Design a protein around this nucleic acid. Sequence first.
RNA 1: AGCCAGGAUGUUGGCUUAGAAGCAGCCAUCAUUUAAAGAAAGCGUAAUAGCUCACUGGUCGAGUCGGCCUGCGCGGAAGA
Lengths: 141, 344, 131, 38
Amino acid sequence: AKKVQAYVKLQVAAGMANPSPPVGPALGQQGVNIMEFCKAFNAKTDSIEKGLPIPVVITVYADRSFTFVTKTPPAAVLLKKAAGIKSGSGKPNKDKVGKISRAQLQEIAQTKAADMTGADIEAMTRSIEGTARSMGLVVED
Amino acid sequence: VAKLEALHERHEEVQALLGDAQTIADQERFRALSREYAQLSDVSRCFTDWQQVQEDIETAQMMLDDPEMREMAQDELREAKEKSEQLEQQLQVDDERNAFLEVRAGTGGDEAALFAGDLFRMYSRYAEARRWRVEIMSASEGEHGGYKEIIAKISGDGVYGRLKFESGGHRVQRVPATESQGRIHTSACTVAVMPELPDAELPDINPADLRIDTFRSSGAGGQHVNTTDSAIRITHLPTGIVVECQDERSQHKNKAKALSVLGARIHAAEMAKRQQAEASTRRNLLGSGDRSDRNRTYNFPQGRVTDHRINLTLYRLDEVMEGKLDMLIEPIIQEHQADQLAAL
Amino acid sequence: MALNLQDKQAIVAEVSEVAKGALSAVVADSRGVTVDKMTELRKAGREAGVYMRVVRNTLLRRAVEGTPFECLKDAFVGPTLIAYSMEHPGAAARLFKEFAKANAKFEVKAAAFEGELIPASQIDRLATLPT
Amino acid sequence: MKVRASVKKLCRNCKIVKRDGVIRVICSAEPKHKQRQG
RNA sequence: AGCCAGGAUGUUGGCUUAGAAGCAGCCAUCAUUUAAAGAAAGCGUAAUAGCUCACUGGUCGAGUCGGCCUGCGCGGAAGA
């Protein structure tokens, strides 16, 4: 009976342990048991794979039951790790990333379609393409 | 290494402190707490990695005396050296500016002087082994021993970051090149290293806090002097210095002399301040070398050169006199960085 | 949005929607959130397509000028904004019925639900559309 | 209020009033934009 | 101009992965949904949270808005 009255988004670097240091005060925001959150957290690390910081949806209720909904891994870490590149951008006149195949972008887009919605699936591939543009990531077929 | 034991319990302690709901209230604590973690976690990982590798060695060390397990030993021993070498650079990570090298003869008179000659050589040779530079500005001779007192200017990169640990008296035991007999003596040479700090200057006045007054000049004259504000006083609020002047008739000619004297004042007092502070620093850095305020002993008859700050002795002196002290000073830096972690 | 070049540009797109459409539905989300349409337009793109482009330009001198030729009965639709929910693929589809279910959950005001044209009638709720 | 010779709008909530010839600036967002004369 | 809604999704987007999550010295000015929304104008937090504006729909319904050339004024203006 208490849906949108307490909302917080968490889940940081999944290759770690009990979230007391980096997450602690954010959990103390409602008085949530950090360990109970850790039971959901560790069950979510083992859910897919560890080593990918993900953003989760947390909604703690009046009766201490919180709904955890994980999301898709962000393209920043995915394109960086899966393509095995470490360049990034910020210095557009000096530094940029090399090319990456469109199917590679599409395979990652396949994943995110399933999670992140819309109307056009090719536009979802274009969404990570937009990510690609600012980060310096060059897309090629 | 015992100092590194304090290091790992400090890591444990991060688990307790970082995680408390009310500790975030103190922006002071929280920032400084996080500062520690940056150094803490990396070097703790460094040390815990070391823990595994180390214990591995002793269990497979004296095990059944088989040379096949020695091949397993062979593998990890090579790893251990290269591994801790990487770990050493992490710990060695500020001041790296140029520095003045002062080495002056202590107790021993002429032999004291002559030994400094040889000592000055090793640092200059050490500099050439690293291609910094070297240029002297003052030199005094002992009539047959080279340098009685010499102030050098070492220009380079990371100079003070290496030569910082040379502050003290150096004791040498050797057959002196001045003894008619073939006796053995003890001589002292004090070595001082101070960082080359910038000597910038202030705008000398900054006319926005200068309480300027004027009044009827006190002294001889006539009707003129009775009704002429021809005397100026400059009061400097940050220092609280007062300069009175009444020489010329014109206030501006008088204000000219006033500003001139006030110039000298603040400029000269600030230099005297730095001068006094530098000698303060220097006498608590040099130490009156009287055979007993040493840090390292260069013993020639036995070919040994030991250091007393970490109680380490080496039986390879010839290369040290040929300026290859990199080896020596590395363990000193390592020991101090170990105590640098347990300083907070 | 400069002038009638672009204003009527929306009207040209509007006429194309009437060219293949027959039936319509009523809806008024004056509290409508992104999350609302992030599902309802997603459900459109999953059901039969993005043909249902929710047009809330119900002004009597705007949207009505867009189609005074077809579906003349839309005159009194002017005030209390109603989006012409056209049904192109499959005349009389289940598009009205799916927002009717949303009518129970969250559609606080259903802008006087009566059933749009092609019975050529009123008020009686059209739930008899071939699904 | 700040008394000056030049009074400009500081935000989107500033308002120029001309009470008794004195141009005065009121701002019901942040009571620090309040000005006078000019 | 008021009065009702939205003002978001990938994205704590790559500071030097501890941090400025549209927000300091960091880049580029992406892509969807469309009646609409800037990877941004401020406040606040280590940061979030939170509240607004652009822009966009219904409403009442008519002139309104910002510059330019100039006449005459107002403040800027306090002495024995």
